[PDB]
Amino acid sequence: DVRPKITLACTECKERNYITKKNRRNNPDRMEMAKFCPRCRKHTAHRETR
Amino acid sequence: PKMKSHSGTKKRFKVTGSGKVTARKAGKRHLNEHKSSRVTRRLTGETVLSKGEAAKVKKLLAGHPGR
Amino acid sequence: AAVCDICAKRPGFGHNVPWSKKKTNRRWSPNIQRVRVVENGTHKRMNVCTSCLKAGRVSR
Amino acid sequence: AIELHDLKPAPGAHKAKTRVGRGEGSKGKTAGRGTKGTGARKNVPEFFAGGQMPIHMQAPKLGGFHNPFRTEYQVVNLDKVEALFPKGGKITVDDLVSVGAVRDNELVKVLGTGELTVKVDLVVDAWSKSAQEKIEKAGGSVTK
RNA sequence: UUGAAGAAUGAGCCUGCGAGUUAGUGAUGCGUGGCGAGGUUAACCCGUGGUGGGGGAGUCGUAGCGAAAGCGAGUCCGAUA
RNA sequence: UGAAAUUGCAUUACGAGUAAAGAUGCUCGUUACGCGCAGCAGGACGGAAAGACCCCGGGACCUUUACUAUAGUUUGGUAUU
Ligand SMILES: [Mg+2]
Ligand SMILES: [Mg+2]
Ligand SMILES: [Mg+2]
Ligand SMILES: [Mg+2]
Ligand SMILES: [Mg+2]
Ligand SMILES: [Mg+2]
Ligand SMILES: [Mg+2]
Ligand SMILES: [Mg+2]
Ligand SMILES: [Mg+2]
Ligand SMILES: [Mg+2]
Ligand SMILES: [Mg+2]
Ligand SMILES: [Mg+2]
Ligand SMILES: [Mg+2]
Ligand SMILES: [Mg+2]
Ligand SMILES: [Mg+2]
Ligand SMILES: [Mg+2]
Ligand SMILES: [Mg+2]
Ligand SMILES: [Mg+2]
Ligand SMILES: [Mg+2]
Ligand SMILES: [Mg+2]
Ligand SMILES: [Mg+2]
Ligand SMILES: [Mg+2]
Ligand SMILES: [Mg+2]
Ligand SMILES: [Mg+2]
Ligand SMILES: [Mg+2]
Ligand SMILES: [Mg+2]
Ligand SMILES: [Zn+2]
Ligand SMILES: [Zn+2]
């Protein structure tokens, strides 16, 4: 509850590529990251699903 | 009476051409977020069975070729 | 009663099947009603099912 | 002139039965079972692992599915076709290979391990790309 | 049974009887015989004369790999890596 | 006239030891002619009962706000209407 599991999906293809954890109090808002999309075949921006 | 095969064994183990008994690696069905890509890759293939376990599997199979 | 004097409908036997599926033996009885009939000028009571009542198979 | 009393089996053909529990000069008393326990009286099932989750339940099920309409091919290789049809085998049909060995009433895809120096015309169901290339280079063809 | 002459069990004695068997065209080895890239029949039919003959339907071997489509001395994960 | 329980045996001493840790049967000694009859109960861990106490495995019956069901009781809908 305090450190939940969050899924990072590409902002291009909506592909739920990664899963990680955060604190939900230190980072109340959805996280932006620069991850690698196996579908888009390059590094795209990944956002926490909502 | 024909002797039946073991249904879980039917569903879980393959027998290769040379006679090896192989199972799917265990531990990747869920709880995969904390597992690294290395741990997941280690659990992602097929495992050749040990001698005693392979003999037990071939006994449980009724001459069934595995899956 | 549970037997229809017309069409000879009789109870069926099956299972109580709970949430745990612990089956128990039980019965299904036909919806038998006791009604006055006048057949060939004879007045009497008859135990008839509602299916033969709906079909008009009994002369009231 | 052999007569019936000079018929005897081959040495080692008729192994003698081992009769158990017939004195201690042989497998006597416990009859090879040891003392006490389960094994002294019945047997142990092979699916049983003593109470620990067994192998056939700790391993994940191989999933997937079975194709209900999958049909297998009786495969023949070019080395076999060269060996069984060496003398400039002109046309080889499914009847010819089934006469040699292809297990008739089946489909007869021809595969391509081997060299196939001879020239053949194989009318068969399906073939591999390598087998077709080797057959055509040798001077022949495939059909059907 | 760690250990019994044991003051641990059983047996008064003799005679008789009393416990690893049988069935699968079961599973898996070995010996042996037949045939051999092939082996073998089941039910059944004929022999009212049997243990012999037919019957190849099926089945195991003949190619594997893949969840499978499929491809095939390769195939699958993979990007015709 | 005529049983019984019991019974591995037998030409079946005692002391101090030793030993599955309390020995007629083992050791070292001591004593002791053979066989009866009537008696007593210290021992043969005497007989009788596969300990009933204790633990372990199984069962049975009893209890309840253990679980899961269910007869009965009750609610409404619908058929009879
Ligand atoms: Mg999954
Ligand atoms: Mg992962
Ligand atoms: Mg109505
Ligand atoms: Mg003995
Ligand atoms: Mg015993
Ligand atoms: Mg023991
Ligand atoms: Mg044992
Ligand atoms: Mg069983
Ligand atoms: Mg064993
Ligand atoms: Mg457990
Ligand atoms: Mg021992
Ligand atoms: Mg003891
Ligand atoms: Mg004794
Ligand atoms: Mg004694
Ligand atoms: Mg005992
Ligand atoms: Mg006794
Ligand atoms: Mg056939
Ligand atoms: Mg002592
Ligand atoms: Mg003494
Ligand atoms: Mg002596
Ligand atoms: Mg006396
Ligand atoms: Mg007395
Ligand atoms: Mg006593
Ligand atoms: Mg006892
Ligand atoms: Mg109980
Ligand atoms: Mg009511
Ligand atoms: Zn993406
Ligand atoms: Zn009726």
From TrEMBL, chain A:
Q: What name appears for this protein in its UniProt entry? A: Large ribosomal subunit protein bL33
Pfam families in the cross-refs? Ribosomal_L33 (PF00471)
Q: Which Gene3D superfamilies match?
A: Ribosomal protein L33
Q: Which residues bind Zn(2+)?
A: C10, C13, C37, C40
Q: Which GO terms describe its molecular function?
A: structural constituent of ribosome
The source organism is Cutibacterium acnes
Top-rank taxon, per record: Bacteria
As recorded in UniProt, coiled-coil segments are none
Family in the record: Belongs to the bacterial ribosomal protein bL33 family.
> Which InterPro entries does the record cross-reference, listed alphabetically?
Ribosomal_bL33, Ribosomal_bL33_CS, Ribosomal_bL33_sf, Ribosomal_zn-bd
Q: Which HAMAP family match?
A: Ribosomal_bL33 (MF_00294)
GO cellular component terms listed in the entry, alphabetical order? cytoplasm; ribonucleoprotein complex; ribosome
PROSITE patterns from the UniProt entry:
RIBOSOMAL_L33
Keyword Ribonucleoprotein appears in the UniProt entry: yes
- GO annotation terms (biological process): translation
Q: Which UniProt keywords apply?
A: Metal-binding, Ribonucleoprotein, Ribosomal protein, Zinc
UniProtKB/TrEMBL annotation, chain C:
Q: Name one GO cellular component term.
A: ribonucleoprotein complex
> Which UniProt keywords are given for this protein, alphabetically ordered?
Metal-binding, Ribonucleoprotein, Ribosomal protein, Zinc
Residues annotated as transmembrane: none
A GO term for molecular function: structural constituent of ribosome
Which InterPro entries does the UniProt record give? Bacterial_rp_bL28, Ribosomal_bL28, Ribosomal_bL28/bL31-like_sf, Ribosomal_bL28_bact-type, Ribosomal_bL28_sf
Family of the protein in this entry: Belongs to the bacterial ribosomal protein bL28 family.
Signal sequence coordinates: none
Q: Which organism is it from?
A: Cutibacterium acnes
Recorded hits in HAMAP family, A to Z, give: Ribosomal_bL28
Could you tell me what this protein is called? Large ribosomal subunit protein bL28
**What does the entry give for GO biological process?**
translation
Report the gene name.
rpmB
Where is Zn(2+) annotated to bind?
A: C4, I6, C7, C49, C52
Q: Write down the superkingdom of origin.
A: Bacteria
Automatic annotation (TrEMBL), chain D:
Q: Which InterPro entries match?
A: Ribosomal_uL15, Ribosomal_uL15/eL18, Ribosomal_uL15/eL18_sf, Ribosomal_uL15_bac-type
Q: Which SUPFAM superfamilies match?
A: Ribosomal proteins L15p and L18e (SSF52080)
Q: Could you tell me where the Low complexity compositional bias lies?
A: 28-42
Q: Which GO terms describe its cellular component?
A: cytosolic large ribosomal subunit
**Alphabetically, which GO biological process terms does the record hold?**
translation
Q: Which GO terms describe its molecular function?
A: rRNA binding; structural constituent of ribosome
Q: Which Gene3D superfamilies match?
A: 3.100.10.10
Q: Which PANTHER family match?
A: 50S RIBOSOMAL PROTEIN L15, LARGE RIBOSOMAL SUBUNIT PROTEIN UL15M
Task: Give the UniProt family note.
Answer: Belongs to the universal ribosomal protein uL15 family.
| Name recorded for this polypeptide | Large ribosomal subunit protein uL15
Query: Could you tell me the gene encoding this protein?
Result: rplO
